[PDB]
Amino acid sequence: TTAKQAEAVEDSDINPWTGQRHSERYFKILKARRKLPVNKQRQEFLDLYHNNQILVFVGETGSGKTTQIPQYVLYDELPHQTGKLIACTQPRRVAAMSVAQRVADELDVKLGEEVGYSIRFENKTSSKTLLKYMTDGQLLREAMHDRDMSRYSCIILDEAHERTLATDILMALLKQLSERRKDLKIIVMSATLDAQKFQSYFFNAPLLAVPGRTHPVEIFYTPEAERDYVEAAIRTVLQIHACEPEGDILLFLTGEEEIEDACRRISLEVDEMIRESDAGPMSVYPLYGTLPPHQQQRIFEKAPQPFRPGGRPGRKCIVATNIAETSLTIDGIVYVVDPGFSKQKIYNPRTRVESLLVSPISKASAQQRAGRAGRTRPGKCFRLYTEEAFKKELIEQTYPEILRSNLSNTVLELKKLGVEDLVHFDLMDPPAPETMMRALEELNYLACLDDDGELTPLGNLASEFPLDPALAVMLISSPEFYCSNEILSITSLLSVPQIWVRPANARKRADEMKAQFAHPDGDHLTLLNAYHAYKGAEARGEDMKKWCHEHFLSYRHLSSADNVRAQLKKIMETHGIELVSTPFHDKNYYTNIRRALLAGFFMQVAMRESSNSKVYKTVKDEQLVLIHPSTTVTTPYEWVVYNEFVLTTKQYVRTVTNIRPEWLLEIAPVYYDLSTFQKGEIKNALTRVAEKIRRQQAMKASKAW
Ligand SMILES: Nc1ncnc2c1ncn2[C@@H]1O[C@H](COP(=O)(O)OP(=O)(O)O)[C@@H](O)[C@H]1O
Ligand SMILES: [Mg+2]
Questions:
Q1: Ligand 1 geometric centre to CA of 67 (Å)
Q2: Are 383 and 221 within 8 A, CB to CB?
Q3: Name one Pfam family in it (predicted).
Q4: Residue spans in the chain of domains classed CATH 3.40.50.300
Q5: CATH 3.40.50.360 for the 1-213 domain, yes or no
Q6: Strand pairing class (185-190; 152-157)
Q7: C-alpha span between 671 and 665 (Å, rounded)
Q8: From atom 11 of ligand 1, which residue's Cα is the shortest distance away?
Q9: Ligand 1 centre and the CA of 77: distance in Å?
Q10: Element (H or E) spanning 667, and its range?
């Protein structure tokens, strides 16, 4: 129970968890581990853990705080083994999976056995699991079925400073739960030191702070901004690899596509650089949210060394998103390239505009990025933006995600959790009252709540799905349109990255191939066609990776979509939701699907303003939009249902499907209650089609007597 006793247990020959003998790797890694900053304060941790129910832990990135602390807890409760588990929550998937693998290696056990991870649609655990690294959202969803979280004896909320939505809701739930369950330990971990609010919130909880031990980082700035930050970044990476000593490079970018393309171009220009120059070898690794486990783990490979000793220093380049900002640490990094951008989620209430958007980072973010370089040795950060700009463009911190998000899912989850008074829920930072209200009416239109604010059977059923309320409701309602299977496929496809691949060498081909999958009526149906082609090839016995390459489709994203589809399907079967399909010979096959979309996306509809323009106008928001140029639809109809709302230089809607206005009035009578529309073109059009519907009811057949 004391620190040295725990160490002596760790030092033993046999593995206490598996009854097998420890490997040499285990002792190598152990001896390595005990050099970490958190180690020398282990005892001080244990004390604080032994005398307190709730504890606040604060340390810099690279301390050991995520990999070591759960293990400290594990070995501490080892002598009196409890039947419950240890949960560590990471706001980022990749962090959870990667760290799970690491701690698996440190405990000398198989991943998914004693140490396991839990992500939405990705479960690497079993009955053997004592330590689970999960996404905070995943734990939040577990709480909905288990309000007291009876399977956990200790819960470690990690990376709390990121102030994500699920983390905050979890903090509230756990504050309220610490009063009921005194047998539950709670450890809140952070990187930013200002956790006095965390203390005050959790009944003045104690604080353990690890002294920062980062080496000095020298910060470099450009003279004047460079418009295209990507090639700036690439030329920077090249200039470093050619004109600097030993070390590894951390290059921050925005998303998957940018990262892959940049990796490829860097690889090319480095390859040519080898044949012509003094520059040594350089391996390049991508790092982003959707990346599969193997490719995640490949970033921890060590750099290649020169062809001949004494010169040509070789190295690694990690082209990562802001995951590498604070969530995880890579050793060997000495240089950091910071273009100053990240993909941030923004939400405007009034305009109802929810969107992902590449935007300027925060001052705090910038400082973290710079900080990573000076861990092992003193390092330098190349910031592409100007110093003056740094000083006065950059917001000082990224505001709480709660403050900038759609709270429909949140309110649904809270209702499922039993919260009967939302506007008093003791969250750390209460959301804007009008925003949460908007969540309430959005839930009202989906018929997930009754007039008493309680869950509709449909709402309760919707909470059982790992989906946004709209998507969930669409899926659940689909049997009424006699196309549940197809809507399942489409839900799955909508829940994974885009499936299209467009390599630089084969663009014209790729595009054309994409066009071959195109359905005339909409993008959802195009996705459906591609997926069906994929399943046909799979059934036929084809090599699906080769088939996907050959057809310019992402095998990763498609297989992922199939995984998601499987899980959603068995959730559907559990709760008695019918799986039905219209015979393809029927003329209503596609119309049933297009209509089925309106069950969940009746609020994301736009109307073409005139024939003299390609401009569409959203319903009840009066937002001017264009159909995104990445459409398989060559003939957009007057009315469209869109899935996404992206903002670049112009406001786009993405993944649109042609619909008939009558369907809006039929499937969505309450929301398209015409008397609740403002004066304008949309109201007039819908009025005309309504009056048209009345003419249609020419029949006077019912009269009986
Ligand atoms: N997947 C991994 N493979 C090898 N080493 C790792 C891995 N993840 C983290 N580490 C090491 O563990 C140390 C502590 O980092 P970690 O505990 O993951 O996060 P935190 O910064 O919260 O402590 C780092 O110095 C890093 O070198
Ligand atoms: Mg960590």
A1: 6
A2: yes
A3: DEAD
A4: 1-213, 214-398
A5: no
A6: parallel
A7: 9
A8: 329
A9: 23
A10: helix 661-667
